[PDB]
Design a protein around this ligand. Structure first.
Ligand SMILES: *[C@@H]1O[C@H](CO)[C@@H](O[C@@H]2O[C@H](CO)[C@@H](O)[C@H](O)[C@H]2NC(C)=O)[C@H](O)[C@H]1NC(C)=O
Ligand SMILES: *[C@@H]1O[C@H](CO)[C@@H](O[C@@H]2O[C@H](CO)[C@@H](O)[C@H](O)[C@H]2NC(C)=O)[C@H](O)[C@H]1NC(C)=O
Ligand SMILES: CC(=O)N[C@@H]1[C@@H](O)[C@H](O)[C@@H](CO)O[C@H]1O
Ligand SMILES: CC(=O)N[C@@H]1[C@@H](O)[C@H](O)[C@@H](CO)O[C@H]1O
Ligand SMILES: CC(=O)N[C@@H]1[C@@H](O)[C@H](O)[C@@H](CO)O[C@H]1O
Ligand SMILES: CC(=O)N[C@@H]1[C@@H](O)[C@H](O)[C@@H](CO)O[C@H]1O
Ligand SMILES: *[C@@H]1O[C@H](CO)[C@@H](O)[C@H](O)[C@H]1NC(C)=O
Ligand SMILES: *[C@@H]1O[C@H](CO)[C@@H](O)[C@H](O)[C@H]1NC(C)=O
Ligand SMILES: *[C@@H]1O[C@H](CO)[C@@H](O)[C@H](O)[C@H]1NC(C)=O
Lengths: 379, 49, 127, 265, 49, 49
C-alpha cells in the first residue's frame, strides 16, 4: 500500500498514511407507528343487502387505513380485478378519497360495468368514466340473497331517452314517452314503465344467479392524502451498526439507550451542528440515541526498505475493543487482514497499534507515534 | 437520485461537489496563513527564550 | 478526509469524484506539513536544553521566595501554582462533536513532559 | 332559523400594545440550551392589538383574516365558544366551523348557508342555553369532519373576578390548518389589558383541510332580553419576520428576541 | 469540437478552461506563500551575515 | 427586424437549426454560429400540396 502511494519501489524508514477505515452496516430495520383506524369496508362487505343499480349505493371512505391484504384474502370471492393499476401494490398507494359503488346484479351483465361498454345498467342506470382508474370485485351472493319463494324486490331501469353522465343517480321513473302520441294517467297504449323488477332465486340458469359487485374509485394527488395500506415494520436492534428508518429518518449508526427528557409533542433531536442524533421510537414511547459508525485513518510504521520488510499498522482514534469487528472477513475497509490479527496489541491515546510490543526502558525517538509514544526497530 | 433522472442529476451533484471542494480549499488557505503567523510568533518566542 | 466530507457513504458520487484528479492528495499533503511544523514549533521552543536538571530539596535562596514558580508535589502533576491558574483560566464535546471525518490528532508532546522541561529550565537558571 | 336584535352602539375598537405575547414552537425538534435563529410569520413585538369588550353589550362583527391571526381572551365564565372561517360565508364554498360547546370539540368543513348574526347567547331568563343553534341553514356537501374531546372550561355563564387567560393562534398554509393553544389561570390584576410576562405557545393539532379562506367571525353562546356578564378579548395580526430563541436544558422555549425592532435588537 | 455542435460544446470547454484557470490560481497562491517564507528566511540570513 | 420565409420538408426542420449541417444547410440556407431570434414552422399541406 505505501509502495503504491509513494509511487516508488522503495519507501524510506518512517511513518506514512494510507487509505481510511470504515465499518459496513450489518443489517436493516424499519419502524412505523401502530396501524389503527381501519377503513370500514368490513361492514359494507358484510352488509345484509345492497340496493339496485339505478339506486346504486355510493359510499364515501377517507382518513383511515385500508388493509388490502385482507381484501385479497376473503373466502367468498369470485372476481377481483383492477383495470387501472396493479392490484398488488395498493398497500403503498395513498389517495385522497374513496368512492364505493355497491350493488347486486345479474351475473351475465357484470362486464358492462367496465367502461367503454354499453348495457342497460351502463346506459340508463350507471356508467363509468372512460379514464376510470379503479377496481371491481364480484362474488357469488345467491346463497344468502336468493330464495326459492321468489325475490322480486330488485329493480333495474330498462328504458330511458338519454344516457346519463358518469356519477349520476336518478330516482324519477316517469311514464316513458316514445312516439308522438301523448300519454298520462295510468297504463295505456305506448306507455311503458322505464324499469323492470328482477327475480333472483337459486333455480334459474347457472350464471344468471345474482352476484354482489363493489367498485372502488379514487382521486390522484390534488388534495391531502387520506387512505392507504399499512406500512410493515420489523423488530428493533441495539448496539450494532444498522440502517434505520424511523418515519423517513434515513441514516446509519448505532442505537443506544438515552438518558434525557423530551416533550410530549417533541419527536426529533439535534445539536449545534444541526444533525439528527436522538429519536423517539413510534410504536413504543422511549428515547433512543444515535451514534455514528466508528471510522478513522490508517498509518503504517516501517523501517527502511532494504533493512527489513516487517511493518506495523496504527488505527487512528479507534477504541480497540471495536477493531475485533475490523478483525473480520469482508467487513473492514482494508483488505490486508493478515495484519488484522498479529502481535501483542498495544493501546495508546491515538488508537491501538498492531505489530509491536511495549517495552518500558528509555531511548530517544526515531518514529514519532504521538501522545508521548515513539517507535523504533531494534532487538 | 430518487426524484431526478439517472443521467441529468449529475449536474446537481457536480454543483454540490464544486461548492464543497471550494469551501475546503478556502479553509486550507486560511489554515496556511494562520500557520505562517503562528510560526512567526514561535520564532519570536524562541529568540526571547 | 478526501471523500467522507464531500459525499461520504455514496457510490456513484464516489465514482464521479475520483475523475477530478489529485486534489485531496495535495490537501492531505498540505495538512500533514502543517501538523509536522506544529510539532517542530514546540520542539524548537522548549528543547534548548539537554540534561534534565532538578532543584535540591533545600529551598533557602538567600531570602528570595520562589515557592510560587517551583513545582509543588501536592498535586499529582508536577505543576506550580501560576501554572495551575493559567490552566484553570483557559477553557475551550467540542473535541468530539466534530464527526464529519474531521480528526484532531494529539500533539507529540504531552503536558507533563513540557512541564518537566520548564522545571529543568527553572532549576538551571536558579542554581 | 335565525333572529336578529342588534340595536347596539358601535364603540371604536380599543387599542393595546402586545407586550411580548405571540411566540410558538415552529417545529417538532429537540434542542438543549442553545440559541437558534429563524425566519417565519410572527406577531411583531409591541404592535397595535385590537381589543373588544363585551358585557346589553353585543360586539362581534366580521373581521379580516390574513396571514393567520392571534386571538386571546381574558375572562372567567367562558362565554365565547366557536369560530367560523371562510372566504365568502354564503354556502358557495366550504367553510370551517369549530364548535366546542358541551359535547365534543367538533370541526366541520362544509358549504353551510349561514345567518346574519350567529347567536347562542340570549336565553330567558337568568341562565344560558345553546338554543337557536341554527347558525347554519343547510348541509350541502360536508367533505371533512373531525371529532375529539372538549377543552378545559367551566359550567354556565357568570361574571366577576376574571381568572382565565386563553390564547390561540390560527395559521393556514399549504392547505394545512395549524391551531396553537395555551391556557393560564390566576390573573390577579385586570386593567382590562394583557399582562406583562413571558409564555411560549404550544402545538395542539393539525388539520389537512385545504380550502380558500379570506375572513373570519367569532361565535359566543329567546333572542330578546338579556344583559350578559362582562368579558374581554383581543385580536392581533402577523407578518413575516426573523427571531432568535433560547431553548433551555429541559427543551422548552424560555426566551425570544426580535431582530428588526431596535439597534440593540 | 470534432463530434458536437458549437452551441453546446462551448459550455463544456468553458467548464474546462475555468477549471484549468482555478488550478493555476491555486499554484500561484502556493508560490506566494513559499516566497513570503523564503523572504523571511533571507532577511534572517542577511542579519546573520 | 428581419423576416425570412420559405417552405421545406417536414422531415428537414432538424437541419434548420444552427450548429449542425446538412444538404439544406450547405447548398440552400444556413444560420450563423450564434443566431438570435425565433423560428415558427407549421404544416401547409392543406393548401400548398
Ligand atoms: C401498539 O400496539 C401494541 C400491540 O397492540 C401495544 O403493545 C403493548 O405492549 C405493552 C408492553 O409489552 C403491553 O403491556 C401491552 O399489553 C401491549 N398492548 C397490546 C398487546 O394490546 C403498544 O402499546 C401500542 N402502542 C401504542 C403507542 O399504541
Ligand atoms: C513563600 O511564600 C509562600 C506563599 O506564597 C509561603 O507559604 C505560606 O506559609 C504560611 C506559613 O508558613 C501559610 O500560612 C500560608 O498559607 C502559605 N501560603 C500559601 C499560598 O500556601 C511561604 O512560607 C514563603 N516562604 C518563604 C521562605 O518566604
Ligand atoms: C381504468 C379503467 O377503468 N380501465 C378499464 C379496463 O380495466 C378495462 O379492461 C377496459 C375494458 O372496458 O375499460 C377500461
Ligand atoms: C334574518 C333576517 O332576515 N334579518 C333581517 C335583517 O337582515 C334586516 O336588516 C331587517 C330589516 O328591518 O329584517 C330582518
Ligand atoms: C392606532 C393607534 O393610534 N395606536 C396607538 C399608537 O399610535 C401609539 O403610538 C401608541 C402609544 O405607544 O398607542 C397605540
Ligand atoms: C324568537 C322569538 O320569538 N323571540 C321572542 C321575543 O321576540 C319576544 O320579545 C319574547 C317575549 O314576547 O318572546 C320570544
Ligand atoms: C538499502 O537500504 C539500506 C538501509 O536499509 C541502505 O543503507 C542502502 O544504501 C540501500 N541500498 C540502495 C539504496 O541501493
Ligand atoms: C474502549 O471501550 C471499552 C468500553 O467502552 C472500555 O472498557 C475500554 O477501556 C476502552 N478502551 C480505551 C479507553 O482505551
Ligand atoms: C516494566 O514492564 C514490566 C513487564 O510488564 C513490569 O514488570 C515492570 O513493573 C515495568 N516497570 C515499570 C517501571 O513500569
Amino acid at each position: 500500500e505505501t509502495k503504491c502511494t509513494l509511487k516508488s519501489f522503495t519507501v524510506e524508514k518512517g511513518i506514512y498514511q494510507t487509505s481510511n477505515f470504515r465499518v459496513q452496516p450489518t443489517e436493516s430495520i424499519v419502524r412505523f407507528p401502530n396501524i389503527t383506524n381501519l377503513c370500514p369496508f368490513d361492514e359494507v362487505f358484510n352488509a345484509t343487502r345492497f340496493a339496485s343499480v339505478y339506486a346504486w349505493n355510493r359510499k364515501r371512505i377517507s382518513n383511515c387505513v385500508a388493509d388490502y391484504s385482507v381484501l385479497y384474502n376473503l373466502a367468498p370471492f369470485f372476481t377481483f380485478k383492477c383495470y387501472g393499476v396493479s392490484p398488488t401494490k395498493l398497500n403503498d398507494l395513498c389517495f385522497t378519497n374513496v368512492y364505493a359503488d355497491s350493488f347486486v346484479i345479474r351475473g351475465d351483465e357484470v362486464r358492462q360495468i367496465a367502461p367503454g361498454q354499453t348495457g342497460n345498467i351502463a346506459d340508463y342506470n350507471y356508467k363509468l368514466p372512460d379514464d376510470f382508474t379503479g377496481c371491481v370485485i364480484a362474488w357469488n351472493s345467491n346463497k344468502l340473497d336468493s330464495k326459492v319463494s321468489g325475490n322480486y324486490n330488485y329493480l333495474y331501469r330498462l328504458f330511458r331517452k338519454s344516457n346519463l353522465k358518469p356519477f349520476e343517480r336518478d330516482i324519477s321513473t316517469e311514464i316513458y314517452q316514445a312516439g308522438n302520441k301523448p300519454c298520462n294517467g295510468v297504463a295505456g297504449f305506448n306507455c311503458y314503465f322505464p324499469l323492470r323488477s328482477y327475480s333472483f332465486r337459486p333455480t334459474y340458469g347457472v350464471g344468471h344467479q345474482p352476484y354482489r359487485v363493489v367498485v372502488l374509485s379514487f382521486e390522484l394527488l390534488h388534495a391531502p392524502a387520506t387512505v392507504c395500506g399499512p406500512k410493515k415494520s420489523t423488530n428493533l436492534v441495539k448496539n450494532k451498526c444498522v440502517n434505520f428508518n424511523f418515519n423517513g429518518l434515513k441514516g446509519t449508526g448505532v442505537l443506544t439507550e438515552s438518558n434525557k427528557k423530551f416533550l410530549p409533542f417533541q419527536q426529533f433531536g439535534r445539536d449545534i451542528a444541526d444533525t439528527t442524533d436522538a429519536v423517539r421510537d413510534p410504536q413504543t414511547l422511549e428515547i433512543l440515541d444515535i451514534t455514528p459508525c466508528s471510522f478513522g485513518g490508517v498509518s503504517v510504521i516501517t523501517p527502511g526498505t532494504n533493512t527489513s520488510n516487517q511493518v506495523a499498522v496504527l488505527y487512528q482514534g479507534v477504541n480497540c475493543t471495536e477493531v475485533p469487528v475490523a478483525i473480520h472477513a469482508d467487513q473492514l475497509t482494508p483488505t490486508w487482514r493478515v495484519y488484522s490479527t498479529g502481535s501483542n496489541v498495544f493501546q495508546t491515546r491515538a488508537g491501538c497499534l498492531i505489530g509491536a510490543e511495549y517495552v518500558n526502558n528509555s531511548y530517544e525517538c526515531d518514529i514519532p507515534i504521538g501522545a508521548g509514544i515513539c517507535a523504533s526497530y531494534q532487538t | 437520485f430518487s426524484r431526478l433522472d439517472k443521467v441529468e442529476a449529475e449536474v446537481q451533484i457536480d454543483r454540490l461537489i464544486t461548492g464543497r471542494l471550494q469551501s475546503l480549499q478556502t479553509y486550507v488557505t486560511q489554515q496556511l496563513i494562520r500557520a505562517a503567523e503562528i510560526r512567526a510568533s514561535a520564532n519570536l518566542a524562541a529568540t526571547k527564550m | 478526509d478526501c471523500t467522507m466530507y464531500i459525499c461520504g457513504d455514496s457510490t456513484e458520487c464516489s465514482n464521479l469524484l475520483l475523475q477530478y484528479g489529485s486534489f485531496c492528495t495535495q490537501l492531505k499533503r498540505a495538512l500533514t506539513g502543517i501538523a509536522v511544523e506544529q510539532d517542530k514549533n514546540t520542539q524548537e521552543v522548549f528543547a534548548q536544553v539537554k540534561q534534565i536538571y532538578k532543584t535540591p530539596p533545600i529551598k533557602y535562596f538567600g531570602g528570595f521566595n520562589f515557592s510560587q514558580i517551583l513545582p509543588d508535589p501536592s498535586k499529582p502533576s508536577k505543576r506550580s501554582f501560576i501554572e495551575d491558574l493559567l490552566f484553570n483560566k483557559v477553557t475551550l464535546l467540542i473535541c468530539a462533536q466534530k464527526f464529519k471525518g474531521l480528526t484532531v490528532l494529539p500533539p507529540l508532546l504531552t503536558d507533563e513532559m513540557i512541564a518537566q522541561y520548564t522545571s529543568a529550565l527553572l532549576a538551571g537558571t536558579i542554581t | 332559523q335565525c333572529v336578529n336584535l342588534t340595536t347596539r352602539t358601535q364603540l371604536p375598537p380599543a387599542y393595546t400594545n402586545s407586550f411580548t405575547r405571540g411566540v410558538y414552537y415552529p417545529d417538532k425538534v429537540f434542542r438543549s440550551s442553545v440559541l437558534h435563529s429563524t425566519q417565519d410569520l410572527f406577531l411583531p413585538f409591541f404592535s397595535n392589538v385590537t381589543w373588544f369588550h363585551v358585557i346589553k353589550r353585543f360586539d362581534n362583527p366580521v373581521l379580516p383574516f390574513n396571514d393567520g391571526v392571534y386571538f386571546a381572551s381574558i375572562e372567567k365564565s367562558n362565554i365565547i365558544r366557536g369560530w367560523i372561517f371562510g372566504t365568502t360565508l354564503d354556502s358557495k364554498t366550504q367553510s370551517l366551523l369549530i364548535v366546542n360547546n358541551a359535547t365534543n370539540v367538533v370541526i366541520k368543513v362544509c358549504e353551510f348557508q349561514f345567518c346574519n348574526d350567529p347567536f347562542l347567547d340570549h336565553k330567558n331568563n337568568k341562565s344560558w342555553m345553546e338554543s337557536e343553534f341554527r347558525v347554519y341553514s343547510s348541509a350541502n356537501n360536508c367533505t371533512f369532519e373531525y371529532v375529539s374531546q372538549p377543552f378545559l372550561m367551566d359550567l354556565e355563564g357568570k361574571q366577576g373576578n376574571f381568572k382565565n387567560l386563553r390564547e390561540f393562534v390560527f395559521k393556514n398554509i399549504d392547505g394545512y390548518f395549524k391551531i396553537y393553544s395555551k391556557h393560564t389561570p390566576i390573573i390577579v390584576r385586570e386593567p382590562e389589558d394583557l399582562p406583562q410576562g413571558f409564555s411560549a405557545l404550544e402545538p395542539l393539532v393539525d388539520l389537512p383541510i385545504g380550502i380558500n379562506i379570506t375572513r373570519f367571525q367569532t361565535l359566543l353562546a329567546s333572542s330578546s332580553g338579556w344583559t350578559a356578564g362582562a368579558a374581554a378579548y383581543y385580536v392581533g395580526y402577523l407578518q413575516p419576520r426573523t427571531f432568535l430563541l433560547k431553548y433551555n436544558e429541559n427543551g422548552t422555549i424560555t426566551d425570544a428576541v426580535d431582530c428588526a425592532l431596535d439597534p440593540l435588537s
